[PDB]
Amino acid sequence: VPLDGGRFATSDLNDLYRRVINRNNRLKRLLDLAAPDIIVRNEKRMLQEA
Amino acid sequence: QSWYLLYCKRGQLQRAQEHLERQAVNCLAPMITLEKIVRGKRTAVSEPLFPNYLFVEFDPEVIHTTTINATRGVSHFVRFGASPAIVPSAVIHQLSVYKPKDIVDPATPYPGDKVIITEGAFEGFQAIFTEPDGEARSMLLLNLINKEIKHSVKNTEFRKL
Amino acid sequence: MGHIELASPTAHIWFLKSLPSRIGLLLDMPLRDIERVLYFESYVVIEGGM
DNA sequence: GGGCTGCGGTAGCGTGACGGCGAATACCC
DNA sequence: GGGTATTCGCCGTGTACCTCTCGCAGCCC
RNA sequence: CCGAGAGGUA
Secondary structure (H helix, E strand, O other): OEOOOOOEOOOHHHHHHHHHHHHHHHHHHHHHHOOOHHHHHHHHHHHHHO | OEEEEEEEOOOOHHHHHHHHHHOOOEEEOOEEEEEEEOOOOEEEEEEEOOOOEEEEEEOOOOOOHHHHHOOOOEEEEOOOOOOOOOOOHHHHHHOOOOOOOOOOOOOOOOOOOEEEEOOHHHOOOOEEEOOOOOOOOEEEEEOOOOOOEEEEEOOOOEEEO | OOOOOOOOOOOOHHHHOOOOOOOOOOOOOOHHHHHHHHOOOOOOOOOOOO
């Protein structure tokens, strides 16, 4: 919901879900494009930590 | 020397690459020319096939990992733990010749596909590509509840499904 | 509710770091080596065999 | 103009709570 | 081979109300 | 109409 102005008082949960979905979409694209071992390792690592 | 992997900031691989070219650090990033809608204009941009990832070859004695970590445009080394990761020479060798398949293009529309409209008096209408005019705009077979129409529009007022 | 299909599976961190770790003393395995497996700096065998 | 994204930088910032408790491990067998 | 003994990192630290300001900067896509 | 920071009454 917005506070009184032109900007939304954002919530922390939507930041967390947006971070998880962005990392998961990047990981799907890298598993599709057959990235090397260390790149998809880092991608799954950042997904785990997110 | 050896090879390390750097994750960079989003959309600053070029700037970090320019700083590491001003330094003595050999970079490597598989660039593929992907046809991407920038601002309404289908511009083929030689963008990285990977995300913000980048490869460097240096030795820690010559230029230190702290100095590489503090480079303008670099987020961090890929670590997995304490030390930054070593990629083996086979990965660098097999990422010399690569990028075979296509101009794959996530989220930019190819013609002969199905889209949606994002603004205007046709917002919410699924459309078929008949024939875009080139690399500048597109032409769309828009649906209605009675009869389909067609229109020559720029690439900001519609997006792919 | 809804869901997100993770392209790689993910250890739930409550069951990993509840102290004592449920995964830890379930696998008869120390928490340090489990985090070394999960955060992608060690391998652990499955069906070593011969 | 705006979608995104988490230190800004070719390092270093942190520094003035305190107790209890239970597990993880160090030292010495 | 386990039996202490030290370290470490997790928990926790009053209630109710009232007022005020301030709440993304940068940016290279 | 949610969070942070500062102050106050009991």
